[PDB]
Write an enzyme that holds these catalytic residues in place. Structure first.
Site, PDB file in Angstrom:
ATOM      1  CG  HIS A  69      -2.088  -1.038   0.910  1.00  0.00           C
ATOM      2  ND1 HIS A  69      -2.079  -2.282   1.533  1.00  0.00           N
ATOM      3  CD2 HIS A  69      -3.214  -0.977   0.142  1.00  0.00           C
ATOM      4  CE1 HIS A  69      -3.150  -2.958   1.148  1.00  0.00           C
ATOM      5  NE2 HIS A  69      -3.920  -2.137   0.344  1.00  0.00           N
ATOM      6  CG  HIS A  73      -1.698   0.205  -4.452  1.00  0.00           C
ATOM      7  ND1 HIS A  73      -2.221  -0.735  -5.300  1.00  0.00           N
ATOM      8  CD2 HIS A  73      -2.736   0.687  -3.725  1.00  0.00           C
ATOM      9  CE1 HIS A  73      -3.521  -0.855  -5.064  1.00  0.00           C
ATOM     10  NE2 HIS A  73      -3.873   0.016  -4.120  1.00  0.00           N
ATOM     11  CG  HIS A 107      -6.958   4.232  -3.746  1.00  0.00           C
ATOM     12  ND1 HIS A 107      -5.836   4.362  -4.500  1.00  0.00           N
ATOM     13  CD2 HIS A 107      -7.032   2.945  -3.373  1.00  0.00           C
ATOM     14  CE1 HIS A 107      -5.239   3.172  -4.582  1.00  0.00           C
ATOM     15  NE2 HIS A 107      -5.942   2.294  -3.876  1.00  0.00           N
ATOM     16  CG  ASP A 108      -4.854   2.313  -0.464  1.00  0.00           C
ATOM     17  OD1 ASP A 108      -5.768   2.158   0.365  1.00  0.00           O
ATOM     18  OD2 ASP A 108      -4.559   1.482  -1.348  1.00  0.00           O
ATOM     19  CG  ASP A 218      -7.957  -0.896  -4.507  1.00  0.00           C
ATOM     20  OD1 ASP A 218      -6.713  -0.674  -4.479  1.00  0.00           O
ATOM     21  OD2 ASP A 218      -8.600  -1.139  -3.535  1.00  0.00           O
ATOM     22  CD  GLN A 270      -3.733 -14.434  -4.455  1.00  0.00           C
ATOM     23  OE1 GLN A 270      -3.934 -13.775  -5.472  1.00  0.00           O
ATOM     24  NE2 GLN A 270      -4.035 -13.966  -3.236  1.00  0.00           N
TER      25      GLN A 270
HETATM   26  C1  JX0 Z   1      -6.666 -13.918  -0.704  1.00  0.00           C
HETATM   27  C2  JX0 Z   1      -6.521 -12.448  -1.118  1.00  0.00           C
HETATM   28  N1  JX0 Z   1      -5.666 -11.933  -2.031  1.00  0.00           N
HETATM   29  N2  JX0 Z   1      -5.943 -10.541  -2.108  1.00  0.00           N
HETATM   30  C3  JX0 Z   1      -5.572  -9.653  -3.118  1.00  0.00           C
HETATM   31  C4  JX0 Z   1      -5.060 -10.280  -4.234  1.00  0.00           C
HETATM   32  C5  JX0 Z   1      -4.765  -9.409  -5.241  1.00  0.00           C
HETATM   33  C6  JX0 Z   1      -4.934  -8.008  -5.191  1.00  0.00           C
HETATM   34 CL1  JX0 Z   1      -4.423  -7.117  -6.659  1.00  0.00          CL
HETATM   35  C7  JX0 Z   1      -5.437  -7.391  -4.032  1.00  0.00           C
HETATM   36  C8  JX0 Z   1      -5.768  -8.235  -2.993  1.00  0.00           C
HETATM   37  C9  JX0 Z   1      -6.906 -10.128  -1.161  1.00  0.00           C
HETATM   38  S1  JX0 Z   1      -7.805  -8.657  -0.519  1.00  0.00           S
HETATM   39  C10 JX0 Z   1      -8.735  -9.696   0.614  1.00  0.00           C
HETATM   40  C11 JX0 Z   1      -9.754  -9.150   1.588  1.00  0.00           C
HETATM   41  O1  JX0 Z   1      -9.486  -8.115   2.210  1.00  0.00           O
HETATM   42  N3  JX0 Z   1     -10.967  -9.708   1.917  1.00  0.00           N
HETATM   43  C12 JX0 Z   1     -11.763  -8.965   2.938  1.00  0.00           C
HETATM   44  C13 JX0 Z   1     -13.154  -8.623   2.347  1.00  0.00           C
HETATM   45  C14 JX0 Z   1     -13.754  -9.770   1.487  1.00  0.00           C
HETATM   46  C15 JX0 Z   1     -12.756 -10.502   0.544  1.00  0.00           C
HETATM   47  C16 JX0 Z   1     -11.466 -10.931   1.257  1.00  0.00           C
HETATM   48  C17 JX0 Z   1      -8.380 -11.019   0.498  1.00  0.00           C
HETATM   49  C18 JX0 Z   1      -7.342 -11.333  -0.515  1.00  0.00           C
HETATM   50 MG    MG Z   2      -7.434   0.799   0.503  1.00  0.00          MG
HETATM   51 ZN    ZN Z   3      -5.586   0.343  -2.876  1.00  0.00          ZN
END
Ligand code: JX0
Ligand code: MG
Ligand code: ZN
Length: 314
Positions: A69, A73, A107-108, A218, A270
């Site tokens: 972050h 990003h 945004h962050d 995002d 993932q």
């Molecule tokens: C597993 C995982 N990989 N990433 C991720 C991968 C790629 C990008 Cl480019 C960005 C993030 C995230 S973000 C996240 C999460 O916060 N939640 C909380 C809300 C509901 C959904 C799950 C879970 C995961």
């Molecule tokens: Mg954010």
């Molecule tokens: Zn972000």
């Protein structure tokens, strides 16, 4: 001096137009890349160059050296928005074009590399000031703070009216990056699109569509070439695992996603995320904005690379 068109080397001039562009490891080129995008997306007249530069450099200064972050990003998410705007020229207002690239860069702002969940469990002051979308209300707050610095008001020529509209677009855009809000937002958009009630003249509809665009930008690390996607994943989990460590310190087993002892489970993690979040996000986005289909196609390519990782074909 308004005949001062920013230009990039040829490979960047061309590949910056594509959804999957990676802004590169040369930090000192990112401000120029952003100005380039604003000028092409918005106009050389949208913003006063000296004011924009001073804004960009203060925004940069207010990102932290966290693994994911960070400032890279910020600029990455702004480029995904530039690609969407450029592919859907006639759909967006002048104020939207101005607001959304700035929203994306901001945004962050001042992210610490911790989730809203962790702030709430730690009992962070920001959790008492902002009961929901904790970090996102903070990011918007830091955005207004910086716009209010002397010589940083890039919106100075807007009327009282246009100024309030643009800051309302930025605020909604930034709140929408709270993934907890994404799920309901997309369900509504999916149901609106399918019952044919979606109406881009309804401001409340536009709002939803800009929120989805914001989620799409995002998450745009899943829409890159596999080597970019895979290496960015390392940064993402560097944060997740630090937060897991901090949960353990508070006396709380974190979720497995954040447990560095459960590294083996990342590939499956993932898959879940591509299936529950990313694919649905880019699918609904492509339904509403057909020219965004390359983001869905690249996401699907990366899902398939994670399946290969699991099958030990890498
Ligand atoms: C597993 C995982 N990989 N990433 C991720 C991968 C790629 C990008 Cl480019 C960005 C993030 C995230 S973000 C996240 C999460 O916060 N939640 C909380 C809300 C509901 C959904 C799950 C879970 C995961
Ligand atoms: Mg954010
Ligand atoms: Zn972000």
């Amino acid at each position: 001096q308004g005949l001062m068109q920013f230009t990039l080397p040829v490979r960047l001039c061309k590949e910056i137009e594509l959804f999957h562009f990676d802004i590169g490891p040369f930090e000192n080129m990112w401000p120029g890349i952003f100005v380039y995008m604003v000028h092409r997306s918005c106009g050389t007249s949208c913003f006063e160059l000296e004011k924009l530069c001073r804004f960009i450099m203060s925004v940069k200064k207010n990102y932290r050296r966290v693994p994911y972050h960070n400032w890279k990003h910020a600029v990455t998410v702004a480029h995904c928005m530039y690609a969407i705007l450029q592919n859907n020229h006639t759909l967006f207002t002048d104020l939207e074009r101005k607001g959304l690239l700035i929203a994306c860069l901001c945004h962050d702002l001042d992210h610490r590399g911790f989730s809203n969940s962790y702030l709430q469990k730690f009992d962070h002051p920001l959790a008492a000031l902002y009961s929901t979308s904790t970090m996102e209300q903070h990011h918007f707050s830091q955005t207004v703070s910086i716009l209010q610095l002397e010589g940083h008001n890039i919106f100075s020529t807007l009327s009282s009216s246009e100024y309030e509209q643009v800051l309302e677009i930025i605020r909604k855009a930034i709140i929408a990056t709270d993934l907890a809000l994404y799920f309901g937002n997309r369900k509504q958009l999916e149901e609106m699109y399918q019952t044919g009630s979606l109406n881009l003249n309804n401001q409340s509809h536009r709002d939803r569509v800009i929120g989805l665009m914001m989620t799409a930008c995002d998450l745009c690390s899943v829409t890159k070439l596999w080597p970019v996607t895979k290496l960015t994943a390392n940064d993402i989990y560097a944060e997740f695992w630090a937060e897991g460590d901090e949960m353990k310190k508070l006396g709380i087993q974190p979720i497995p996603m954040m447990d560095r002892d459960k590294k083996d489970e990342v590939p499956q993690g993932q898959l879940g995320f591509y299936n529950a979040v990313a694919i649905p996000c880019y699918t609904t986005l492509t339904q509403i904005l057909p020219p965004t289909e390359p983001l869905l196609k690249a996401c699907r390519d990366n899902l398939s690379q994670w399946e290969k990782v699991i099958r030990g074909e890498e």
